[PDB]
């Protein structure tokens, strides 16, 4: 399998952080709910959660982010980026 395109893959925010483990718990209780039923759910518990799981979640969203980021730029000004199989401006 290939991973990654065009950049870095944004990684999900701390909100869907949760919402991507938690929507397995519910396929498994509701393997039939779809897609658009199953994130319907969980939304509720977000706000139903603690003071030290909703915030810690944005947290941990933060780390991580910042590895993509570099993803971004730190890829796009390198010289691999520029050399490729393509023709045209030649030093003038």
Same mark, same amino acid.
Request: aromatic share 10%; proline share 8%.
């Given at each position: 399998?290939?991973?990654?395109?065009? #950049?870095?893959?944004?990684?999900?925010?701390?909100?869907?952080?949760?919402?991507?483990?938690?929507?397995?718990?519910?396929?498994?209780?509701?393997?039939?709910?779809?897609?658009?039923?199953?994130?319907?759910?969980? #939304?509720?518990? $977000?706000?139903?959660?603690?003071?030290?799981?909703?915030?810690? %979640?944005?947290?941990?969203?933060?780390?991580?982010?910042?590895? %993509?980021?570099?993803?971004? $730029?730190? %890829?796009?000004?390198?010289?691999? %980026?520029?050399?490729?199989?393509?023709?045209?401006?030649?030093? #003038?």
């Amino acid at each position: 399998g290939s991973s990654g395109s065009s #950049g870095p893959k944004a990684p999900v925010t701390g909100y869907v952080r949760f919402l991507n483990e938690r929507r397995e718990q519910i396929r498994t209780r509701h393997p039939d709910l779809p897609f658009p039923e199953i994130t319907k759910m969980l #939304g509720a518990e $977000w706000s139903k959660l603690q003071p030290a799981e909703k915030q810690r %979640y944005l947290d941990e969203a933060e780390k991580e982010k910042q590895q %993509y980021l570099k993803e971004l $730029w730190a %890829y796009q000004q390198s010289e691999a %980026y520029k050399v490729c199989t393509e023709s045209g401006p030649s030093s #003038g």
